[model samples]
Target chain A: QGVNIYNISAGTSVDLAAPVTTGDIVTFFSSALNLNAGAGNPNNTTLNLFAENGAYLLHIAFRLQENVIIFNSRQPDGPWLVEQRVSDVANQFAGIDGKAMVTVFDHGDKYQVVINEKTVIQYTKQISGLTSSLSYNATEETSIFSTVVEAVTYTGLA
Target chain B: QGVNIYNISAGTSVDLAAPVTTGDIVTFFSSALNLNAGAGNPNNTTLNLFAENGAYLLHIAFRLQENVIIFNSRQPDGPWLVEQRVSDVANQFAGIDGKAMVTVFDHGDKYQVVINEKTVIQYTKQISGLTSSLSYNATEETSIFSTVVEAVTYTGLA
Candidate 1:
């Protein structure tokens, strides 16, 4: 098995469409997420994947109001999580011109987030037993998927 | 062995980015798909999984010209068949919800399309055991995913 991508388009407002199963690598680009070049809001451009029960196992935002890629967890209503500041560091989520790729697996401890293919961020999402029906969602525009060009699900090397 | 979902956005305009093989399960969400819903196309806010020859093995549409949640088959192109019509009946394709999940299996006689986990649409794609070079596509938007998430190959359960 290889990778499978569920493709969609840009913005903040979402209906949680893309399906996410355990052990799958899910990547959301900050390029496609960051709106209007250098000027943007953190909350607007983000990545969110929720379980059928409304649990956000994967929630990450690019360009935060005060930070550079703010992540969330637990449920829809949250106090946010660790805010990885975008820096000149290689592979870190460098906002404005930054992007990140996340892998949601069943490890329940460690996960991987690759930023701009030049970096890797270790992340951990809510536990899952490879359950089905996990969807992608976002709000507003300027982020999310604006074009389904490269957005697709293929085999994985798992 | 399990389901892997490569995340991306929608609105068809594909170069067959995702490399899919036989027995891969593909899905399209009208709620997430309907986001502007997808490329603003009422008839094509969908995802297409093709075979080695660019033939759609699983063609699922949220809202068709005269129908909703329309399904298709054969290969290359042609008579887009119907497995369900959005109706008021229980366990039927209720397009109002506008969501669908399609599985392109190795069944030589029929495939399966589960409607919101309430019903099933078992039909046939091209008669074959298991092949490779499958691809997935969709329409407009950016944040969801910039380009096809992957070009992966997988082993199907035969």
Candidate 2:
């Protein structure tokens, strides 16, 4: 029995900010917010669970500036290693329509990062456990921003 | 007043112990006395020259050892350079009855050492205005050994 201007009033809300164990999945989304002309933001983000634990796994980053899609990895707060640049700078804007998706998966000791259904980077590292405190932002002042998170699942072993 | 021998000695010679002026033409003889195999006497050596005042000139050395003809070179007392080795070492020996002819030619900045009219080694060095003393020793152990310096020539701008 709350405000129903458009039939979208809230009943109950649950907090999901807790320690993520091995084999748990988490996903987040960016609100429909416009980013500054020259700012970088992710539209949707997802993190998966696997069974290996230590320091090395795969991490992928996508940047809109220069329209570059790069695959790189490191151990945690890394000395990131760049494996390759997959996009042609001259043709980097292919299917980017103001939204991007980043997905991370682990298979045993090997991990992979995919962007927009395309495998961007794959790597094996020492770290097997992954954390799930996901956050994202979109800015209008080239810096001000907002984000939203959706669903999470855990698979148990990598 | 020379007698006719079965093998006539044909080559040039010069007493290198003396000073040689510019434009002096010199030749060398391959015919030399045979030395006994038992004695490793360097006195069985053929020619030795000393350049008191170094000059930029070419020098070549050809010797037949172990049935092989080897070519080597030096600038006065400078470093020795190996030029070439020939397979026809047996041809360098004097007739069983007498000596052979070894020829040496000095052409300004280049020199040539030949055996039986065949070019063995050619050497060139940066030399300047200087006088050199030269000598030769050709005596076989227990046998009479003799070497004849046929010719020596100098050509260069003073």
Q: Which candidate has the highest lDDT of all?
A: 1
Candidate 1 segments exceeding 4 Å error? A1-21, A24-61, A65-67, A70-109, A112-158, B1-13, B22-25, B29-48, B54-56, B59-111, B115-119, B124-126, B129-158
TM-score of chain A of 1: 0.56
DockQ of each: 0.04, 0.00
Tell me the deviation in Å of residue A70 in model 2.
Answer: 99
Compared to the true structure, candidate 2 yields what TM-score? Answer: 0.31
How does model 2 fare in lDDT?
Answer: 0.36
Candidate 1 C-alpha RMSD relative to the actual structure: 10.2
Each candidate: fraction of true contacts kept? 0.00, 0.00
Q: Which stretches of candidate 2 lie over 4 Å from their true place?
A: A1-158, B1-23, B29-44, B54-65, B69-84, B93-97, B126-131, B142-158
Name the lDDT value of residue B10 in candidate 2: 21
- What tens-digit string does per-residue lDDT give for candidate 1 at B1-158? 22233334333333423333444444433322232333224453344555566565666555433335556655565555545445322234334333333334333554555543333555555534334333334444421223343322223322
Place model 1 in a CAPRI quality band.
incorrect
